[PDB]
Amino acid sequence: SLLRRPGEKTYTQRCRLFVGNLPADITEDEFKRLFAKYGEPGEVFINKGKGFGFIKLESRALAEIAKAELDDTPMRGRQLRVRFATHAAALSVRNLSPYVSNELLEEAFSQFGPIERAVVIVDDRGRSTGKGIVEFASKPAARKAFERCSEGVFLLTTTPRPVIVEPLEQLDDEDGLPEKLAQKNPMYQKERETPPRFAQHGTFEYEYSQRWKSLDEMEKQQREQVEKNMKDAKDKLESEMEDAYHEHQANIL
Amino acid sequence: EKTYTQRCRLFVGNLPADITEDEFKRLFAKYGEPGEVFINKGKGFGFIKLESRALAEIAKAELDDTPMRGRQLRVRFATAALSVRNLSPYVSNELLEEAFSQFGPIERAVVIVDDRGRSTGKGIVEFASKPAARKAFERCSEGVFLLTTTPRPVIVEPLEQLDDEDGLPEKLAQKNPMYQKERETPPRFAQHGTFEYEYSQRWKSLDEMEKQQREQVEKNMKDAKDKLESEMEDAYHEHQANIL
Ligand SMILES: [Zn+2]
Ligand SMILES: [Zn+2]
C-alpha cells in the first residue's frame, strides 16, 4: 500500500517479524488483522500448534513500527512477544580491503543468487573494520556463496585478499537472561547470598582473583603474540610468492 | 522503565540551513512531550529525547528519509558502554544492573545469551555518560569486582561502537590513489596456478593455523585457570599465619 517504494527490494528477511505467545485458537485472518495497519502483508507462516508465527511487511520501517506498537500487547489473556526474525540466509565476510564498499560487496555476492543487502561494518570514524555481512533472499544462495568462497579464492579488489566467509553469529543482546530464569537454579540463593563487591587485600577471593587476572593478562599477551607471529608469516609468504611468480619482472616461463 | 533516557535520544541530520527550534519540535509533536532538544546549526543536525524507546523507534522509522524543505532527513539513534566477561551463569540482566549502578546511572544492562537462552558469560552495561563508564572501567581494571559468592573477577572493556546499518557507502569512499589502485581489478574467483590464487590459498592455510594456535592458547590457559582454584585452596594462608 506504500505510495513510494522504500527501495529497490521490499518484503526482505529484514522485514520479517517473529510473533510469540499467540492464542491456541489463532486463525490466519486474526493474525493478518493484527498487522492490517502496516500495509499489504507478505509471506505469513503460523505455527498454531506451538503458538508463534512470522510475517513479512513491505519495509524495514513498517516492521520497526509494528514491533514497537505490538510488542507486549494483550491478545485473549496472553502478552504478545514481537521480535525481528533472526536472518535465515546471512553470512559474515572478513579479510575485506578497506576500499570495499557496501555496493561492491553486494555486486560481488549477487553472482551466487538474489541478494537482499550487503554492508561493510565500519568503526566510530566511518572506516572499514575489514568485516561485513551479506544477506541473501534464499538459504541455497547463502550455501553456494559459503561453499564456493570456502573451496576457491574470491577476490573483490586488486590486492589478493581472499574473502573469508563464515556463518553469521546471531546472539541475543535484547532479552538476555532475566532474573526470572536465573532463579530456577538451586544454588542461585547461595550465589546471591554475597552481594556485588570489591575484593579486599588478604582475602582468599582477592588472591584467587588477582592470580586469575594475571593468567587472563598472560592469555591476552599470548593471543596477541600469535597474531603478530602469523602476520610476519603472512608477510614472508607474500614476499616468497612474489619472487616465485617474478611479479615485478618479465619472464617467458 | 525510565523515561527520556539516552536510549530515547535521536540524531536528526540534513536539517534545512534555516531550521528553527520550534520547527524541529513540531517535527516530533506526534510523539508526545519532547525532552531535551539541541541543534548544532554549524553542521545541520539536532538531537531530541522522547519519552520511551518504543516512541523513539516509531519516530525514527516514520521520519528517516522524509523530505524537509529540500533534503531528506537522516534519523538515527544517537550513540558510554562496557563489555563485561567472565560472568557466571547465575548473573542475570538485573544483577548486572544492580552491581554496576554504584558507578553511575545505568541505561541498559544485559547478559548476552544463545538461542537456547543460556549465558554466553558476556554482557553489556551502558551508562548515561562516558565519565560514569570510564569510572566503572578504571575501578574494575585496578580492583577485583565480584558479583556473586563464588569469586569470578568481572573483566570490563570499553565496547567499541560499530555501524552495520549505514556501513561504508560507495559515495563516502575517499577516491584517493589507494582507492584507484584497489578498484582497477573487479570481483573474481582466482584461477589455479596464478600468483593471486596460489598466494591466497597459502594465506588461507596460515589464517586457519592462526585460528588453531589462538584456540590452543585459550585451551592451555583454560587448563591453567581451572587448576588455580585447587592450587589456591591448598596454598592460601592469612598474613598473620607465619610471623616472627
Ligand atoms: Zn599483603
Ligand atoms: Zn594450484
Numbering used by the authors:
A (entry chain A): 283 to 535
B (entry chain B): 290 to 368, 371 to 535
Paper lines:
SFPQ is an RNA- and DNA-binding protein that is involved in many aspects of RNA biogenesis as well as DNA damage repair. The DBHS family proteins share a high sequence similarity within the central DBHS domain which comprises two RNA-recognition motifs (RRMs), a NonA/paraspeckle (NOPS) domain and a long coiled-coil domain. It has previously been shown that SFPQ homo- and hetero-dimerizes via the central DBHS domain and polymerizes via the extended coiled-coil domain, which is critical for its nuclear functions, such as transcriptional regulation and paraspeckle formation. We have previously discovered that SFPQ directly binds to zinc, which promotes the formation of infinite polymers of both the SFPQ homodimers and SFPQ/NONO heterodimers.
Here we characterize two familial ALS (fALS)-associated SFPQ variants, which cause amino acid substitutions in the proximity of the SFPQ zinc-coordinating centre (N533H and L534I). Both mutants display increased zinc-binding affinities, which can be explained by the presence of a second zinc-binding site revealed by the 1.83 Å crystal structure of the human SFPQ L534I mutant. The calculated affinity (IC50) of SFPQ N533H (0.25 µM) and L534I (0.54 µM) binding to zinc was approximately 5.8- and 2.7-fold higher than that of the WT protein (1.45 µM), respectively, confirming that these fALS-associated mutations cause significant increases in SFPQ zinc-binding affinity. The final model consisted of two chains of SFPQ (residues 283–535 in Chain A and residues 290–368, 371–535 in Chain B), two Zn atoms (one of the two with half occupancy), and 277 water molecules. A closer inspection of the two zinc centres showed that the first zinc coordinating centre (Zn centre 1) is almost indistinguishable from that of SFPQ WT, coordinated by His A483, His B530, His A*528 and a carbonyl oxygen of Leu A*535, where the asterisk (*) denotes a symmetry-related dimer (x, y, z – 1). However, the anomalous signal from the second centre (Zn centre 2) is significantly lower than that of Zn centre 1, indicating that this site is not fully occupied. The second zinc coordination centre is composed of three amino acid residues: Glu B*489, Glu B529 and His B*483 (symmetry operator: x, y, z – 1). The side chains of Glu B529 and His B*483 are in the ‘in’ position coordinating zinc, whereas in the absence of zinc, they take on the ‘out’ conformation. Zinc in the second centre is modelled with the occupancy of 0.5 in the final structure with a comparable B-factor value (28.1 Å2) to those ligating atoms (average B-factor of 26.8 Å2). Taken together, the crystal structure of SFPQ L534I in complex with zinc reveals an additional zinc-binding site, providing the structural basis for the apparent increase in zinc-binding affinity in this mutant.
